[PDB]
């Protein structure tokens, strides 16, 4: 079973390319990019204004997630 901080706030699945917003919130890249294009330019959780270019790769989470794969699925 998966922990929650590994799963996407939007995707509800294991994150594959985690980005973190200026609020400190981490999303899977495709899902947050799809939210920004279809819903609006705001953080799904904090609601503060958000654009695609402000997403930051959460590099430490990417290796946390990779280590989960290397243990199970």
């Amino acid at each position: 079973e998966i922990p929650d901080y590994l799963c996407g706030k939007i995707s509800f699945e294991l994150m594959r390319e985690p980005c973190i917003t200026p609020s400190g919130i981490t999303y899977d890249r495709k899902d947050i990019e799809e939210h920004l294009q279809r819903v609006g330019h705001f953080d799904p959780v904090t609601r503060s204004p958000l654009t695609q270019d402000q997403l930051i790769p959460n590099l430490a989470m990417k290796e946390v997630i990779d280590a989960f794969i290397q243990e199970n699925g």
Partner: protein
């Protein structure tokens, strides 16, 4: 991000309020292009042995400001039971009694109060606190000598 921008807008707001209504004997503001790093000036209060001296302080705001206190230290040497040779200030507002409702203006007022009225019973420098409590004539003498040697 959100947090840093929030801190910046509040530091900015506190700077503006302070320049619009300066204290007569004090000042504080960013050293250059860095809003998180300020310098302050305190005139030694008349009716105290720091009379006539000028004291400079550095202020570093945290990224969590206003939800963490600023870091404040003297860069001018001063003889005081709650201020040490590194310039560190033992003062409640800067430690356990911080509140996000307080401001740099209130930090400066509190430090001035501290210079007029030490807290020797909770000392940072115990020997100075002892001379303060047992021999105020000598404390005043040495404090004025330090003011003349280091702040005039």
């Amino acid at each position: 991000g959100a947090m840093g921008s929030k801190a910046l807008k509040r530091i900015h707001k506190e700077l503006n309020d302070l320049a619009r209504d300066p204290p007569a004997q004090c000042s504080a503001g960013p050293v250059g292009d860095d809003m998180f790093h300020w310098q302050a000036t305190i005139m030694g209060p008349n009716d105290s042995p720091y009379q006539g001296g000028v004291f400079f302080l550095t202020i570093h705001f945290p990224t969590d400001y206003p939800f963490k206190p600023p870091k404040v230290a003297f860069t001018t040497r001063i003889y005081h039971p709650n201020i040490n040779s590194n310039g560190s200030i033992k003062l409640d507002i800067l430690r356990s009694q911080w509140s996000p409702a307080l401001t740099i203006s209130k930090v400066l007022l509190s430090i001035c109060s501290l210079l007029c009225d030490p807290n020797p019973d909770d000392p940072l420098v115990p020997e100075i606190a002892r001379i303060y409590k047992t021999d105020r004539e000598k404390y005043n003498r040495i404090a004025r000598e330090w003011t003349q040697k280091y702040a005039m």
